[PDB]
């Protein structure tokens, strides 16, 4: 809890993250998703053959989320444009760590 700042993402929040910062872990190599034949080559055994499928699996958590979510490389977000409130304390007491339930969508728009 002191180290993370998590919440519940929005539908738009998933789209921006997969399109702008989506990188697939193809053969233990971080590879950008500039073509659908990079997903369907590896995630084809789960009917995921496009990006809209991959978003549909992530956003609406399905029974193939684990293979889908482990396929995406961890997102290398940028520094938060606009500045945090306080990195140390919890979000409830003015800070930024902890479960900022729906406000995590605002945090993405700036960091992404």
């Amino acid at each position: 809890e002191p180290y993370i700042a998590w919440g519940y993402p929005n539908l738009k929040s998933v789209n921006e993250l997969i399109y702008k910062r989506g990188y697939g872990k193809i053969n233990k190599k971080r590879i950008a998703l500039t073509d659908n034949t990079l997903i369907a080559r590896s995630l084809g055994k789960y009917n995921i053959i496009c990006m809209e499928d991959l978003i549909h699996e992530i956003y609406t958590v399905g029974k193939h989320f684990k293979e889908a979510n482990n396929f995406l490389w961890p997102f290398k977000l940028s520094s938060p444009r606009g500045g945090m409130k306080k990195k140390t304390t919890h979000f409830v007491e003015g800070g930024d760590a902890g479960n900022r339930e729906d406000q995590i969508n605002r945090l993405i728009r700036r960091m992404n």
Partner: protein, 51 residues
Amino acid sequence: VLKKNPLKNLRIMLKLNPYAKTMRRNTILRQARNHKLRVERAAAALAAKSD
């Protein structure tokens, strides 16, 4: 391959999500439709403030 942004770069998105063409072919005819209907109601209000 130089990764281009599908949000900024239109045809990169259509290489990944071909339905985005008609997604953006709509939501523009619609916005040019509601902007039309807005103007007519704003015009018809000036005919009620005179009579």
